[PDB]
Design a binder for these strands. Structure first.
Ligand SMILES: [Zn+2]
Ligand SMILES: [Zn+2]
Lengths: 196, 205
DNA sequence: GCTCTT
């Protein structure tokens, strides 16, 4: 087992409510969003919101290249899932721990967060509460950076269904059919469940 | 023919000195500077400083789109020349007055300057003295926004030579070939000068 | 390196 850190990134969904003062250029960027599902996917595009998807997709892609830089380990396993949640759009990004010792993970993530604010919000701090948070272990004093097994993916992420499920990206060969396919997810979670 | 307003914009050239506290992302943006001269040009790249050029090019380009927005004149002629000057890099941006009455130019420029500080220096007020200045007329009570004739370009801008000359951009087809070509500049200024002095001499009856 | 955002 390699082990995964989980970072939850809230994705702004209301431009006035969440990105006060963003440029017109950003508005045009998200407003000209055309995403299509791949031919192998069985998801209803009609329940996938295009603007937050644009933002979340660039967010995760740039997060991952910055992670490869700071970890000195490209081809590092990852699984990112973008969801329409309780109150905010957010995505769970799971990255292999290799290359980043847990103690310094907080600081490296802060640096990545600042690069993202400069790159994809052009300097505007998003007004989302706790919008870029590594998930800790019992939220107590000091805490501890929780490390999840690969079994986190079938136990918690794959079972999500639309509209809560919005999108998903992955390095891992086990899950590339399952990212945008609901039936592949159902069969994979059932397989992991009976295998216990 | 319409005149030109001249705005002189100082371009920061020493990061910690002029943009104190700027993000590292800005540092990376300017340090990743590769500008190549077009093939028609006869300038020595080795005398063109790349980072201030990156800042200056974006500065003039965004000033120009903001100007077209403000003037409601999207085809307005311009001529921008970026130079390594007395003590700071700066650039003279000349824009056709059409679209902006002189009374309101001050405030429209104020707005453009704030937009530039926000979208380029990412909120950091540059510590350059008088860094965004419309040129006035005799500097007296109120001043008076000077309107320069197109002849300002050959009389004063084109004769510049490296390393003072750094870069140039133009709408005006009279000066396309001349922006980054020293010999075309020399020829154009020679043409203007002889034409003007000979037709002033012809004013002897 | 990126201020012309997959
Ligand atoms: Zn969730
Ligand atoms: Zn000068």
């Amino acid at each position: 087992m390699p082990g995964f850190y989980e970072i939850v990134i809230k994705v702004p969904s209301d431009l006035d409510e969440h990105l006060p003062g963003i440029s017109d250029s950003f508005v045009n960027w998200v407003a000209e969003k055309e995403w299509e599902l791949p031919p192998d996917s069985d998801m209803d595009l009609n329940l996938i919101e295009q603007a937050p998807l644009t933002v979340a997709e660039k967010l995760q892609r740039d997060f991952l290249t910055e992670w490869r830089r700071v970890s000195k380990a490209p081809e590092a396993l990852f699984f990112v899932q973008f969801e329409k949640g309780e109150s905010y759009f957010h995505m769970h990004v799971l990255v292999e721990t290799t290359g980043v010792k847990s103690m310094v993970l907080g600081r490296f993530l802060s640096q990545i967060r600042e690069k993202l604010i400069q790159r994809i919000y052009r300097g505007i701090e998003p007004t989302l509460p706790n919008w870029f948070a590594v998930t800790k272990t019992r939220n107590g004093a000091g805490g501890g950076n929780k490390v999840v097994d690969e079994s986190y993916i079938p136990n918690y992420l794959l079972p999500k269904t639309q509209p809560e499920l919005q999108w998903a990206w992955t390095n891992m060969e086990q899950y590339l059919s399952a990212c945008l396919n609901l039936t592949e997810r159902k069969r994979l979670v059932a397989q992991h469940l009976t295998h216990v």
